Write a protein that binds this ligand. Structure first.
Ligand SMILES: *[C@@H]1O[C@H](CO[C@@H]2O[C@@H](C)[C@@H](O)[C@@H](O)[C@@H]2O)[C@@H](O[C@@H]2O[C@H](CO)[C@@H](O[C@@H]3O[C@H](CO)[C@@H](O)[C@H](O)[C@@H]3O)[C@H](O)[C@H]2NC(C)=O)[C@H](O)[C@H]1NC(C)=O
Ligand SMILES: *[C@@H]1O[C@H](CO[C@@H]2O[C@@H](C)[C@@H](O)[C@@H](O)[C@@H]2O)[C@@H](O[C@@H]2O[C@H](CO)[C@@H](O)[C@H](O)[C@H]2NC(C)=O)[C@H](O)[C@H]1NC(C)=O
Ligand SMILES: *[C@@H]1O[C@H](CO)[C@@H](O)[C@H](O)[C@H]1NC(C)=O
Lengths: 98, 218, 223
């Protein structure tokens, strides 16, 4: 029921699809779960694997919040802030690899 | 909190739940009748006007007459760096003053600059996830932990539960770390996952900001 | 569609709006009717479940011209490469044949190896976003210029002129954008291209799949 648009920019290319992450009936998420879902759509949409990310030049995603701020998360970082985040506060997610 | 136990009701009357859209998302500590202290990243990206500050709670799933609820009037930060997760502390001035009683009391802070050595025995607490399949805690949880300095930055207080997989989890951000009766830490970030058993949990080091905190609550 | 205008309702009766179910969520694409039982689109629009809506103008409205049909097969090109976005073409076999009329009928495909000379003005249509902040509920369209291959070779490392078309003058703020994938590039009322990818900004040129290069696979698959 909860959805958040995302896009993937890989090596300077982005398909013209309009895609969303579903959060079903569970709007409360966290950055560990979110990084996991971002890695899954990276694998499923553009065939990008964990090794690919491990050795990528740059690999991050930017969460844009509807209030207007943003937060940048490194795909190769294992540090996660311990807070819960509500899906309805997120405007969009932009994924950048290389 | 993963691997913890239920707190007895109102054992920690300075413990605060921050709530948005009806749900707990971060903890906090009452540090004066009209000021609470939490992690900067908890509110860096939220509509501060929508946050409810809930004092005197124990079981969040139940109606509790002991609760006192406030709004946030103003926020104060102290150089928060979201790239490096440095200075992860915020003070929220409430729209009123709490009524102090057995269930709602102000916490005690350490002196400026006091560092904790390896092995100090502390207590973490919070309403965060009980696990990666078990869900968010309704009753306040508590957990015995030990201060460690290996695999920790000098700009954090880090803690570990040695010998089993337990630690703070998502939703525990902003909650206090209690050591010898004083709030020495504000839960900030975990490494790899909750309760890894290898990497310590990282708290913002309250003792480093005591002079600033005093300048704010005055 | 960036920099375009509202289409005249039902002026493009081959246009298909696709609702796609994926593991992580839902997607939206375009496509176009090429026979009463087949829709052509981009392979990166594939998902485990796809609903096709034909005969639409405002897709956020329940219109009586609309025919909703499930895709019973979604056939990606066998050499489709998700990472490089090569061989980005997919055929959708509809679970039932469409009821052909004025609001729903197929569009012609080109000849094999048919030229699309640089400078040719074509039209693309879709229900995609119109800026990095706003979308549309009704079909929009824009005219774009076929580019010389060198305009994309200097930008896109997996661009292949044998399989793809370079489209859109950089100096015009006109492009297909998010949600327009799979829609047709129309030149002379023949579908020569399929919206595929570009730069994340939306700044042209962008890359279309070249339909004429895949005519043998298209005909084989539909037989
Ligand atoms: C788990 O942690 C609890 C609580 O920890 C203590 O309080 C926190 C709020 C922080 O300030 C921590 O830094 C601090 O260590 C420990 O509880 C404490 O246990 C000790 C005994 O191990 C108690 O002292 C005894 O109390 C009894 C009365 O029951 C006396 O008869 C004894 O002479 C002695 O004084 C202490 O009172 C108790 N504190 C609290 C607040 O309950 C607990 O020991 C610890 N467990 C483990 C296994 O580490
Ligand atoms: C201080 O603010 C509290 C909290 O207000 C609620 O939370 C805010 C985030 C925002 O959503 C407000 O619109 C909410 O009302 C006030 O508590 C409410 O007060 C009203 C009026 O007195 C009362 O009807 C509600 O029941 C209260 N809600 C709760 C949850 O207690 C409080 O009144 C404010 N105090 C002062 C002095 O301004
Ligand atoms: C397709 O439509 C059916 C019936 O309306 C619905 O159950 C299903 O969820 C839809 N699938 C997609 C991908 O939109």
């Amino acid at each position: 029921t909860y959805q958040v648009p995302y896009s993937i920019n890989l090596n300077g290319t982005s398909t013209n699809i309009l895609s969303n992450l579903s959060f079903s009936n569970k709007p409360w998420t966290n950055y560990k779960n979110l990084t996991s879902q971002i890695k899954s759509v990276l694998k499923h949409d553009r065939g990008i694997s964990e090794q690919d990310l491990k050795y990528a030049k740059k690999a991050y995603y930017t969460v844009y919040f509807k209030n207007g701020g943003k937060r940048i998360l490194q795909l190769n970082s294992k540090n996660y802030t311990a807070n819960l985040v509500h899906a309805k506060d997120v405007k969009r997610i932009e994924i950048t690899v290389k | 909190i993963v691997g913890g136990r239920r707190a007895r009701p109102h054992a920690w009357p300075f413990m605060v739940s921050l709530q948005l859209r009806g749900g707990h998302f971060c903890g906090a500590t009452l540090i004066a009748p009209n000021f609470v202290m939490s992690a900067a990243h908890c509110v860096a990206n939220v509509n501060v006007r929508a946050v409810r500050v809930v004092l005197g709670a124990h079981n969040l799933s139940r109606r509790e007459p002991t609760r006192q609820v406030f709004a946030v009037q103003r926020i104060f930060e102290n150089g928060y760096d979201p790239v490096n997760l440095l200075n992860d502390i915020v003070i929220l001035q409430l729209n009123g003053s709490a009524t102090i009683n057995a269930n709602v009391q102000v916490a005690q802070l350490p002196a400026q600059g006091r560092r904790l050595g390896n092995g100090v025995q502390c207590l973490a607490m919070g309403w965060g996830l009980l696990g990666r399949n078990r869900g968010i805690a309704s009753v306040l949880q508590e957990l015995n932990v030990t201060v460690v300095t290996s695999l920790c930055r000098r700009s954090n207080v880090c803690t570990l539960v040695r010998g089993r997989q337990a630690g703070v989890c998502f939703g525990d951000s902003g909650s206090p770390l209690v050591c010898n009766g004083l709030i020495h830490g504000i839960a900030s970030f975990v490494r790899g996952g909750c309760a890894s058993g290898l990497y310590p949990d990282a708290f913002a080091p309250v003792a480093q900001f005591v002079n600033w905190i005093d300048s704010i609550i005055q | 569609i960036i920099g375009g205008r509202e289409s005249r309702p039902h002026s493009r009766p081959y246009m298909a709006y696709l609702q796609i179910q994926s593991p992580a969520g839902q997607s939206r694409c375009g496509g176009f009717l090429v026979r009463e039982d087949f829709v052509l689109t981009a392979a990166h629009c594939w998902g485990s479940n796809i609903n096709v809506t034909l005969g639409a103008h405002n897709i956020q409205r329940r219109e009586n011209t609309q025919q909703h049909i499930t895709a019973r097969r979604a056939i990606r090109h066998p050499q489709y490469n998700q990472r490089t976005i090569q061989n980005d073409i997919m055929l959708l076999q509809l679970s039932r044949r469409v009821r052909r009329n004025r609001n729903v009928n197929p569009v012609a495909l080109p000849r094999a190896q048919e030229g699309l000379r640089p400078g040719t003005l074509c039209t693309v249509a879709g229900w995609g976003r119109v800026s990095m902040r706003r979308g549309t509920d009704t079909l929009r369209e824009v005219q774009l210029r076929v580019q010389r291959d060198r305009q994309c070779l200097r930008i896109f490392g997996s661009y292949d002129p044998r399989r793809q078309i370079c489209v859109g003058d950089r100096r015009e703020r006109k492009a297909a954008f998010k949600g327009d994938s799979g829609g047709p590039l129309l030149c002379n009322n023949v579908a020569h291209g399929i919206v595929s990818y570009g730069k994340s900004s939306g700044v042209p040129p962008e890359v279309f799949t070249r339909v004429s290069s895949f005519l043998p696979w298209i005909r084989t698959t539909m037989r």
